[PDB]
Ligand binder design. Structure first.
Ligand code: A1IDB
Ligand code: NA
Length: 328
C-alpha cells in the first residue's frame, strides 16, 4: 500500500530540500541523505484537481516513466549493453498526504528568487496520492551551462557521451528519448579521464574532459522488452507539434513526419534528430569561456560543423556512433 511522505522523506532529508526544477507534471527537489545529494521528482496522481493547469495522471499513465527510468538506470550494471549516461534511479514510492509544509517552504524560496509558473502545491488533501521518484544527482543541465563550458572539445565529449548512451539504449531496449532538449542533458565534474560503455559486447572509452553526461526525463520516451512496447501515445495531441521560436519545436513535427504519427513503432531516427538539435545548440545558442583560437581546436570545430552537416543522413545513434568520422 501507499506510505506517508515521512517514509521517503524523514525530517532531516525533508529539512534539507531545495527546489531545483518544475514542470506541469509537478515538482523536482534536491536534498542530502547519507552525505549524498539526490533529486526528488514528485507527481500528484489520481486526483480530480487541475495541477499547474492540467489533469493529474492516473497510476497507469505514470508507469511508463517508472519502467523506462528503471530500465535505463539498470544499463549501468549490464554487460553487452552498458552505459552510465542515463540517470540512476534510487527508488520509487507511492505516497499519501497533503504536501509537507517544509516542501512548501522550499517551493516559496524558489518562487521568490527565481519565480515559478506552477500553482503553490498547498491545496492537496490528506488522501492525495503522489509518485516520488528519487534519482542520482546528475549536476546542472545544458541550458543553464550555455556560458559555463570551457572549450568546444568539451562539446565533443558531450555529443560522444550522448550518442554512445542512446546507441547502447537502441541496442538494448529499442529506445527513443523523444524529448531530449538541452534541459534534459545534465553535467557533472568527474575525476575519470576515460568513460566506459559496451555496445553489443564491444567495449570502448570516451575522453570526459572531466564531465559526466546524464540524460534525464523519460516522459515522452519509448522502448520494448520481448515485444512489450512502453511509450507515450501523443497521436491525439495538438500543442506539442504547434510550438515554435526554437529548433526544438520542429523536432516534434519532424518525429511525427518520420513515424507517421504511429508512436508505438521504433523510429531510432528520432534520436538522430535530437542529437542534431543538440549539435545545433552547441554551434549557435551555446557560447564558451575559451573560443577556438589554436590549430588542433579548430580541427575539432570543423569535425562538429561536419557532424551538424552530415549526421541527419544517419538512421540511428547506433549508425552515428559506429560509422561517423567524428568518433573515429
Ligand atoms: C540535478 N538533477 C536533476 C535530476 C533529475 C532526474 C530526473 C528527472 S525527470 C525530470 C527532471 C527535471 C525536470 C525539471 N527540472 C529539472 C529536472 C529530472 N531531474 C537529477 N539530478
Ligand atoms: Na549518469
Amino acid at each position: 500500500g501507499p506510505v506517508p511522505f515521512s517514509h521517503c522523506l524523514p525530517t532531516e532529508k525533508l529539512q534539507r530540500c531545495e527546489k531545483i526544477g518544475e514542470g506541469v507534471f509537478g515538482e523536482v527537489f534536491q536534498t542530502i541523505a547519507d552525505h549524498t545529494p539526490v533529486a526528488i521528482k514528485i507527481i500528484a496522481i489520481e486526483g480530480p484537481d487541475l495541477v499547474n493547469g492540467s489533469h493529474q495522471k492516473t497510476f497507469e499513465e505514470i508507469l511508463p516513466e517508472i519502467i523506462i527510468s528503471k530500465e535505463l538506470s539498470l544499463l549501468s550494471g549490464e554487460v553487452c549493453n552498458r552505459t552510465e549516461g542515463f540517470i540512476g534511479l534510487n527508488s520509487v514510492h507511492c505516497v499519501q498526504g497533503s504536501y509537507p509544509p517544509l516542501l512548501l517552504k522550499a517551493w516559496d524560496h524558489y518562487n521568490s528568487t527565481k519565480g515559478s509558473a506552477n500553482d503553490r502545491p498547498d491545496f492537496f488533501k490528506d488522501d492525495q496520492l503522489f509518485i516520488v521518484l528519487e534519482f542520482e544527482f546528475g549536476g546542472i543541465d545544458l541550458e543553464q551551462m550555455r556560458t559555463k563550458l570551457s572549450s568546444l572539445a568539451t562539446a565533443k565529449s558531450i555529443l560522444h557521451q550522448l550518442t554512445a548512451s542512446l546507441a547502447v539504449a537502441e541496442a538494448s531496449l529499442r529506445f527513443e528519448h523523444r524529448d531530449l532538449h538541452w534541459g534534459n542533458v545534465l553535467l557533472k565534474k568527474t575525476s575519470l579521464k576515460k568513460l566506459h560503455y559496451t555496445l553489443n559486447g564491444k567495449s570502448s572509452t570516451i575522453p570526459s574532459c572531466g564531465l559526466q553526461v546524464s540524460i534525464i526525463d523519460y516522459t515522452l520516451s519509448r522502448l520494448e522488452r520481448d515485444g512489450i512496447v512502453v511509450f507515450c501515445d501523443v497521436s491525439m495531441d495538438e500543442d506539442l507539434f504547434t510550438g515554435d521560436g526554437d529548433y526544438q519545436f520542429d523536432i516534434y513535427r519532424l518525429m511525427k513526419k518520420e513515424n507517421n504519427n504511429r508512436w508505438g513503432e521504433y523510429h531510432p531516427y528520432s534520436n538522430v534528430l535530437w542529437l542534431h538539435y543538440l549539435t545545433d545548440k552547441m554551434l549557435k545558442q551555446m557560447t564558451f569561456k575559451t573560443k577556438c583560437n589554436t590549430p588542433a581546436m579548430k580541427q575539432i570545430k570543423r569535425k562538429i560543423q561536419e557532424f551538424h552537416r552530415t549526421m541527419l543522413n544517419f538512421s540511428s545513434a547506433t549508425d552515428l556512433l559506429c560509422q561517423h568520422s567524428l568518433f573515429k
